[PDB]
Amino acid sequence: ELDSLLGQRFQVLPGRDKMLYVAAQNERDTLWARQVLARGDYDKNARVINENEENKRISIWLDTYYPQLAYYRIHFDEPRKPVFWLSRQRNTMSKKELEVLSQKLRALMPYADSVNITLMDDVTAAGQAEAGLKQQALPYSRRNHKGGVTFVIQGALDDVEILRARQFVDSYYRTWGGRYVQFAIELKD
């Protein structure tokens, strides 16, 4: 526990399933801690997690049990108290349903004391997309789709402009996830 700590930018967290959960900040560290733990006696006492993998794991569960849920992403700034961003506008759940959801999520994350559900404003999510693209003089057309919006970047983009556009998009999805606003580049000329 403190034992695992000494083994190693990480937070080691006790789980209700008697597992030890090592929270890492990114991919490189996740693989490193896995390499390290596998070489010794904790090799099956610990599991290394990070925000990208845990979002993927919870999204698969929700795909079946809450298949129409309008959500963004779960954030792990404090890994003992993950915060699940849901859409305020597109939420269809009563207060009691959201409480049930929080409890199921907590059961799915044995290292978490609680899972707070925060209702986020779609106007903010789309407004950060709009602002980021404008910040790069990227013309775009916003095109609504079923339960989403696509910002379609448009123009005869060169090498660097495409990379800058895609780097912005990746940074956008790290915050909001890719389930509401999505992006595309239409190449012209």
From Swiss-Prot:
Superkingdom assignment: Bacteria
Keywords associated with the record: Cell membrane, Membrane, Transmembrane, Transmembrane helix, Virulence
Subcellular location: Cell membrane
Entry's Gene Ontology cellular component terms: plasma membrane
The UniProt record lists the keyword Cell membrane: yes
Main location: membrane
Protein known as: Protein PrgH
Naturally occurring in which organism (per UniProt): Salmonella typhimurium (strain LT2 / SGSC1412 / ATCC 700720)
Recorded name of the encoding gene: prgH
Complete-protein stretch covered: 172 to 363 of 392
